[PDB]
Scaffold this active site. Sequence first.
Site, PDB file in Angstrom:
ATOM      1  N   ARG B  37       0.634  -1.251   0.150  1.00  0.00           N
ATOM      2  CA  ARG B  37      -0.013   0.106  -0.103  1.00  0.00           C
ATOM      3  C   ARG B  37       0.898   1.314  -0.066  1.00  0.00           C
ATOM      4  NH1 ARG B  37      -1.242   3.376   4.020  1.00  0.00           N
ATOM      5  NH2 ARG B  37      -0.462   1.520   5.469  1.00  0.00           N
ATOM      6  N   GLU B  74       0.125   4.687  25.086  1.00  0.00           N
ATOM      7  CA  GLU B  74      -0.903   4.212  24.115  1.00  0.00           C
ATOM      8  C   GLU B  74      -2.150   3.354  24.696  1.00  0.00           C
ATOM      9  OE1 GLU B  74      -0.066   1.194  21.167  1.00  0.00           O
ATOM     10  OE2 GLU B  74      -0.989   2.338  19.586  1.00  0.00           O
ATOM     11  N   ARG B 162     -14.362 -20.067  26.628  1.00  0.00           N
ATOM     12  CA  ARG B 162     -13.587 -20.272  25.290  1.00  0.00           C
ATOM     13  C   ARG B 162     -13.746 -18.909  24.336  1.00  0.00           C
ATOM     14  NH1 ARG B 162     -13.890 -26.802  25.689  1.00  0.00           N
ATOM     15  NH2 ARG B 162     -16.218 -26.161  25.189  1.00  0.00           N
ATOM     16  N   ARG B 163     -14.560 -18.077  24.973  1.00  0.00           N
ATOM     17  CA  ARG B 163     -15.108 -17.062  24.236  1.00  0.00           C
ATOM     18  C   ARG B 163     -14.475 -15.630  24.583  1.00  0.00           C
ATOM     19  NH1 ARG B 163     -21.112 -19.440  24.662  1.00  0.00           N
ATOM     20  NH2 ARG B 163     -20.667 -21.400  23.476  1.00  0.00           N
ATOM     21  N   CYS B 182      -4.548  -3.233  12.614  1.00  0.00           N
ATOM     22  CA  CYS B 182      -3.460  -4.433  12.674  1.00  0.00           C
ATOM     23  C   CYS B 182      -3.782  -5.238  13.156  1.00  0.00           C
ATOM     24  CB  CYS B 182      -1.913  -3.656  12.805  1.00  0.00           C
ATOM     25  SG  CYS B 182      -1.706  -2.530  11.409  1.00  0.00           S
ATOM     26  N   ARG B 202      -2.985  -9.074  11.766  1.00  0.00           N
ATOM     27  CA  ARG B 202      -3.314  -9.121  10.276  1.00  0.00           C
ATOM     28  C   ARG B 202      -2.126  -8.636   9.457  1.00  0.00           C
ATOM     29  NH1 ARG B 202      -3.766  -4.660   7.349  1.00  0.00           N
ATOM     30  NH2 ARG B 202      -4.303  -2.940   8.875  1.00  0.00           N
ATOM     31  N   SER B 203      -1.193  -7.873  10.075  1.00  0.00           N
ATOM     32  CA  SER B 203      -0.280  -7.102   9.136  1.00  0.00           C
ATOM     33  C   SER B 203       0.582  -6.701  10.558  1.00  0.00           C
ATOM     34  CB  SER B 203      -0.797  -6.047   8.590  1.00  0.00           C
ATOM     35  OG  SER B 203       0.032  -5.379   7.877  1.00  0.00           O
ATOM     36  N   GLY B 204       1.920  -7.195  10.262  1.00  0.00           N
ATOM     37  CA  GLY B 204       3.050  -6.769  11.123  1.00  0.00           C
ATOM     38  C   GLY B 204       4.349  -6.313  10.664  1.00  0.00           C
ATOM     39  N   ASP B 205       4.511  -5.012  10.608  1.00  0.00           N
ATOM     40  CA  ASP B 205       5.889  -4.390  10.436  1.00  0.00           C
ATOM     41  C   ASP B 205       6.882  -4.905  11.386  1.00  0.00           C
ATOM     42  OD1 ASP B 205       7.908  -2.649  10.145  1.00  0.00           O
ATOM     43  OD2 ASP B 205       6.736  -1.003   9.820  1.00  0.00           O
ATOM     44  N   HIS B 243       5.953  -8.857   7.673  1.00  0.00           N
ATOM     45  CA  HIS B 243       6.808  -8.408   6.593  1.00  0.00           C
ATOM     46  C   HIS B 243       7.859  -7.491   7.082  1.00  0.00           C
ATOM     47  CE1 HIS B 243       3.198  -5.982   7.236  1.00  0.00           C
ATOM     48  NE2 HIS B 243       4.043  -4.841   7.068  1.00  0.00           N
ATOM     49  N   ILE B 244       9.038  -7.480   6.310  1.00  0.00           N
ATOM     50  CA  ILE B 244      10.049  -6.312   6.532  1.00  0.00           C
ATOM     51  C   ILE B 244      10.160  -5.400   5.415  1.00  0.00           C
ATOM     52  CG2 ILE B 244      12.555  -6.084   6.539  1.00  0.00           C
ATOM     53  CD1 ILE B 244      12.611  -9.040   7.867  1.00  0.00           C
ATOM     54  N   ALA B 299       6.710   3.913   6.969  1.00  0.00           N
ATOM     55  CA  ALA B 299       6.285   3.962   5.882  1.00  0.00           C
ATOM     56  C   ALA B 299       4.785   4.739   5.989  1.00  0.00           C
ATOM     57  CB  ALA B 299       6.065   2.848   4.979  1.00  0.00           C
TER      58      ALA B 299
HETATM   59  C1  LIG Z   1       3.892   1.107   8.006  1.00  0.00           C
HETATM   60  C2  LIG Z   1       3.547   1.269   9.794  1.00  0.00           C
HETATM   61  N1  LIG Z   1       4.432   0.583  10.432  1.00  0.00           N
HETATM   62  C3  LIG Z   1       4.091   0.609  11.558  1.00  0.00           C
HETATM   63  O1  LIG Z   1       4.799  -0.174  12.497  1.00  0.00           O
HETATM   64  C4  LIG Z   1       2.995   1.395  12.236  1.00  0.00           C
HETATM   65  C5  LIG Z   1       2.891   1.514  13.460  1.00  0.00           C
HETATM   66  C6  LIG Z   1       1.881   2.356  13.659  1.00  0.00           C
HETATM   67  C7  LIG Z   1       1.408   2.595  15.545  1.00  0.00           C
HETATM   68  N2  LIG Z   1       2.417   2.206  16.367  1.00  0.00           N
HETATM   69  C8  LIG Z   1       2.336   1.137  17.443  1.00  0.00           C
HETATM   70  C9  LIG Z   1       3.782   2.569  16.475  1.00  0.00           C
HETATM   71  C10 LIG Z   1       4.374   3.567  15.663  1.00  0.00           C
HETATM   72  C11 LIG Z   1       5.798   4.153  15.852  1.00  0.00           C
HETATM   73  C12 LIG Z   1       5.965   3.307  16.710  1.00  0.00           C
HETATM   74  C13 LIG Z   1       7.577   3.276  17.455  1.00  0.00           C
HETATM   75  O2  LIG Z   1       7.863   2.153  18.325  1.00  0.00           O
HETATM   76  N3  LIG Z   1       8.045   4.319  17.323  1.00  0.00           N
HETATM   77  C14 LIG Z   1       9.790   4.543  17.869  1.00  0.00           C
HETATM   78  C15 LIG Z   1      10.616   4.242  16.951  1.00  0.00           C
HETATM   79  C16 LIG Z   1      10.552   5.117  15.580  1.00  0.00           C
HETATM   80  C17 LIG Z   1      11.519   4.587  14.407  1.00  0.00           C
HETATM   81  O3  LIG Z   1      12.328   3.923  14.757  1.00  0.00           O
HETATM   82  O4  LIG Z   1      11.397   5.203  13.424  1.00  0.00           O
HETATM   83  C18 LIG Z   1       9.617   5.904  18.329  1.00  0.00           C
HETATM   84  O5  LIG Z   1       8.995   6.939  18.067  1.00  0.00           O
HETATM   85  O6  LIG Z   1      10.803   6.396  19.099  1.00  0.00           O
HETATM   86  S1  LIG Z   1       5.007   1.933  17.365  1.00  0.00           S
HETATM   87  C19 LIG Z   1       1.114   3.248  12.881  1.00  0.00           C
HETATM   88  C20 LIG Z   1       1.381   3.083  11.656  1.00  0.00           C
HETATM   89  C21 LIG Z   1       2.457   2.161  10.981  1.00  0.00           C
HETATM   90  N4  LIG Z   1       2.682   2.048   9.793  1.00  0.00           N
HETATM   91  O1  LIG Z   2     -16.706 -25.545  13.642  1.00  0.00           O
HETATM   92  C1  LIG Z   2     -16.762 -25.786  14.900  1.00  0.00           C
HETATM   93  C2  LIG Z   2     -17.752 -25.510  15.838  1.00  0.00           C
HETATM   94  C3  LIG Z   2     -17.259 -25.688  17.147  1.00  0.00           C
HETATM   95  N1  LIG Z   2     -16.243 -26.445  17.455  1.00  0.00           N
HETATM   96  C4  LIG Z   2     -15.964 -26.670  18.918  1.00  0.00           C
HETATM   97  C5  LIG Z   2     -15.127 -26.113  20.004  1.00  0.00           C
HETATM   98  C6  LIG Z   2     -15.796 -26.566  21.288  1.00  0.00           C
HETATM   99  O2  LIG Z   2     -15.359 -27.751  21.606  1.00  0.00           O
HETATM  100  C7  LIG Z   2     -17.174 -26.370  21.031  1.00  0.00           C
HETATM  101  C8  LIG Z   2     -17.842 -24.887  21.110  1.00  0.00           C
HETATM  102  O3  LIG Z   2     -17.965 -24.717  22.624  1.00  0.00           O
HETATM  103  P1  LIG Z   2     -17.343 -23.499  22.899  1.00  0.00           P
HETATM  104  O4  LIG Z   2     -16.047 -23.142  22.821  1.00  0.00           O
HETATM  105  O5  LIG Z   2     -18.248 -22.431  22.546  1.00  0.00           O
HETATM  106  O6  LIG Z   2     -17.461 -23.685  24.478  1.00  0.00           O
HETATM  107  O7  LIG Z   2     -17.377 -26.916  19.647  1.00  0.00           O
HETATM  108  C9  LIG Z   2     -15.170 -26.981  16.656  1.00  0.00           C
HETATM  109  O8  LIG Z   2     -14.259 -27.561  16.966  1.00  0.00           O
HETATM  110  N2  LIG Z   2     -15.534 -26.377  15.463  1.00  0.00           N
HETATM  111  O1  LIG Z   3       0.100  -1.347  15.553  1.00  0.00           O
HETATM  112  C1  LIG Z   3       0.447  -1.334  14.285  1.00  0.00           C
HETATM  113  C2  LIG Z   3      -0.263  -0.875  13.232  1.00  0.00           C
HETATM  114  C3  LIG Z   3       0.272  -1.004  12.161  1.00  0.00           C
HETATM  115  N1  LIG Z   3       1.226  -1.968  11.820  1.00  0.00           N
HETATM  116  C4  LIG Z   3       1.957  -2.109  10.252  1.00  0.00           C
HETATM  117  C5  LIG Z   3       1.710  -3.129   9.461  1.00  0.00           C
HETATM  118  C6  LIG Z   3       1.858  -2.378   8.009  1.00  0.00           C
HETATM  119  O2  LIG Z   3       3.106  -2.404   7.840  1.00  0.00           O
HETATM  120  C7  LIG Z   3       1.266  -1.122   8.364  1.00  0.00           C
HETATM  121  C8  LIG Z   3      -0.267  -1.134   8.015  1.00  0.00           C
HETATM  122  O3  LIG Z   3      -0.605  -1.080   6.645  1.00  0.00           O
HETATM  123  P1  LIG Z   3      -1.699  -2.039   5.961  1.00  0.00           P
HETATM  124  O4  LIG Z   3      -1.255  -3.590   6.404  1.00  0.00           O
HETATM  125  O5  LIG Z   3      -3.176  -1.319   6.377  1.00  0.00           O
HETATM  126  O6  LIG Z   3      -1.358  -1.706   4.532  1.00  0.00           O
HETATM  127  O7  LIG Z   3       1.210  -0.728   9.698  1.00  0.00           O
HETATM  128  C9  LIG Z   3       1.975  -2.675  12.620  1.00  0.00           C
HETATM  129  O8  LIG Z   3       2.867  -3.439  12.508  1.00  0.00           O
HETATM  130  N2  LIG Z   3       1.314  -2.392  13.933  1.00  0.00           N
END
Ligand SMILES: Cc1nc(=O)c2cc(CN(C)c3ccc(C(=O)N[C@@H](CCC(=O)O)C(=O)O)s3)ccc2[nH]1
Ligand SMILES: O=c1ccn([C@H]2C[C@H](O)[C@@H](COP(=O)(O)O)O2)c(=O)[nH]1
Ligand SMILES: O=c1ccn([C@H]2C[C@H](O)[C@@H](COP(=O)(O)O)O2)c(=O)[nH]1
Lengths: 301, 300
Positions: B37, B74, B162-163, B182, B202-205, B243-244, B299
């Site tokens: 992105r 934060e 478990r919920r 993220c 979902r997405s880790g820098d 990702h890096i 970025a």
């Molecule tokens: C591309 C991207 N990567 C990220 O990790 C990211 C993180 C946030 C939120 N977040 C959770 C953080 C943002 C900045 C941080 C941090 O630790 N900053 C340090 C180091 C900065 C640097 O190395 O440039 C600092 O400000 O001291 S932690 C928002 C948008 C993002 N976007």
């Molecule tokens: O597709 C599914 C639906 C449920 N469960 C299992 C996990 C638990 O053993 C139980 C659900 O109970 P709770 O985790 O909600 O207690 O059914 C699965 O393994 N897969």
């Molecule tokens: O707390 C956060 C917030 C964002 N991201 C990173 C992942 C991606 O590099 C970027 C978000 O971009 P998208 O995945 O939404 O494109 O910031 C983190 O690692 N941790």
Amino acid sequence: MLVVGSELQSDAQPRHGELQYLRQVEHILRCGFKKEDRTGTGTLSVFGMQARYSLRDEFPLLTTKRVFWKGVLEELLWFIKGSTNAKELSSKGVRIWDANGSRDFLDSLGFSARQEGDLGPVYGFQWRHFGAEYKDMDSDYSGQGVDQLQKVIDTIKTNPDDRRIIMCAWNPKDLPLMALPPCHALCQFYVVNGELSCQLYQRSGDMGLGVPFNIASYALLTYMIAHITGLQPGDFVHTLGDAHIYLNHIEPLKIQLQREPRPFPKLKILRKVETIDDFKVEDFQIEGYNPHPTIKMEMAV
Amino acid sequence: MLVVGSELQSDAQRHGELQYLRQVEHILRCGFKKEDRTGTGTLSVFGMQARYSLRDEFPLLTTKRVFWKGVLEELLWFIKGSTNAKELSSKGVRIWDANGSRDFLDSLGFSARQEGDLGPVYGFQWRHFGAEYKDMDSDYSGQGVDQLQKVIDTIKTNPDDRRIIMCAWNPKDLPLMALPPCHALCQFYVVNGELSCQLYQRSGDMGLGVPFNIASYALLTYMIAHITGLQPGDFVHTLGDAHIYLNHIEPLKIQLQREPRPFPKLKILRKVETIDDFKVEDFQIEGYNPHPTIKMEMAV
Ligand SMILES: Cc1nc(=O)c2cc(CN(C)c3ccc(C(=O)N[C@@H](CCC(=O)O)C(=O)O)s3)ccc2[nH]1
Ligand SMILES: O=c1ccn([C@H]2C[C@H](O)[C@@H](COP(=O)(O)O)O2)c(=O)[nH]1
Ligand SMILES: O=c1ccn([C@H]2C[C@H](O)[C@@H](COP(=O)(O)O)O2)c(=O)[nH]1
Ligand SMILES: Cc1nc(=O)c2cc(CN(C)c3ccc(C(=O)N[C@@H](CCC(=O)O)C(=O)O)s3)ccc2[nH]1
């Protein structure tokens, strides 16, 4: 003591897909802790596991016990159509949700007034109508809420690099109306090198019953979306929260761990399908599935 | 070549910190090129997991100093329900300022929105899931689902459940967010009087956000464990697109040659009864002897 097939080797957390599953079972038996549960059965449990199943010219339907493929396929088509009526699935000879939609179960949850079968706002509804106001399983929700499934398909086509390609059934607002909160809380898709991969976050995994069926289900969904987007299947990544073995599954699983796996089958899609809603049961063909016999794993209710 | 400290050994999925370093190693060794992105480009792997013990230690990285002041501020800001970057910036923590900037907001079409208004992100979803977002300083008292308090109450009443999940991923609200979360969701778990937490990220820098994020969720788990009378257990970190960014490769290669030191301890300095009552002055990080910070640019 616990004895297992010699091929498992180290159970500690791609190639040899089935062994990933069998090693998780072993690991829970060997290292899991006793944890009481909602159903009153008791489990052995580990929190946090991950396994990767390649989808590349193979389909991960377990061979050490026969898995209920007809049910996997009918269930997923039922989800796709947005259904939350367990009776509609049961009419296809797939009774997996009947217990949870039963008059007595629904009543136990305090859902006296809703019709039998009505699972509430679960996968079918959240995947196709997220955010819409649930009424009942028969209501027309056309054009209401977010169609996450189509949105995932549209994003894969237009921006395969996107890191936000997620479908989420966990809806905190709707939880109180669900007969069972979803075990599959969310999945994410990913594209690199012309391959589509999928990761499932499964909050709770019954390793003997649901989990083998669940792996097959998300592998199938990935094959379907790959087909529609013109990609090849990549990996299915299975992440678990509470990974557990019910106490009455320990002996059955110990039988299973001693069986020799056979190679996975293949899945064929028998025609060109253009949209996700156009898939039908007749479009799919499992080839070369050679499982060992079924092992009964009862469902804890 | 890639050269690394001898203690990493196998990077395939002693120290908790080595699991992070091994992930970074793995992405450099085995990751694929993937565009993104921000326009920057990455090396990427899909699907990773690591487990950090929280038992008498706290996973603040020692191979590079992590911005602990920002982690703490934060999280306190999330707990208050805030989505106003200015209120965090006023604490000297500028980590959300770019995402809240006039220019970035305009890039997304939010020209009428006040600067600093991140949209219905974590603070709002954690405390008000389902409520109708208007703006960052609107009054949402009693609106939506308070997931945070529900988590705490469940751990107290039914630890085996478990919920026990807090989810920031809200498909309805996503188009209003300056950055979709993220951290999509997290789940808590109790066994043998220990509280553990799993994060779905979902997405880790790997260079910038991920070390900060690890410390964030560890701290959350310490807070909740304290309120519920439990001990911290594990923090399980699950990644989607791990990702890096290309401009972090050489800084991370520096890091990977540094010798890890033992992790610090986190102390909670008084008995706190409610999550809302935690303050910066309630915490002490003891024994943090990191190697120096390595600048990893953000970025976009
Ligand atoms: C591309 C991207 N990567 C990220 O990790 C990211 C993180 C946030 C939120 N977040 C959770 C953080 C943002 C900045 C941080 C941090 O630790 N900053 C340090 C180091 C900065 C640097 O190395 O440039 C600092 O400000 O001291 S932690 C928002 C948008 C993002 N976007
Ligand atoms: O597709 C599914 C639906 C449920 N469960 C299992 C996990 C638990 O053993 C139980 C659900 O109970 P709770 O985790 O909600 O207690 O059914 C699965 O393994 N897969
Ligand atoms: O707390 C956060 C917030 C964002 N991201 C990173 C992942 C991606 O590099 C970027 C978000 O971009 P998208 O995945 O939404 O494109 O910031 C983190 O690692 N941790
Ligand atoms: C405790 C519990 N565990 C589960 O795995 C579970 C699963 C579902 C839904 N689901 C996803 C499935 C339910 C049953 C399946 C199944 O594969 N049944 C086979 C094997 C039956 C058996 O061995 O007892 C079959 O019916 O042939 S797959 C609902 C409630 C649950 N509750």
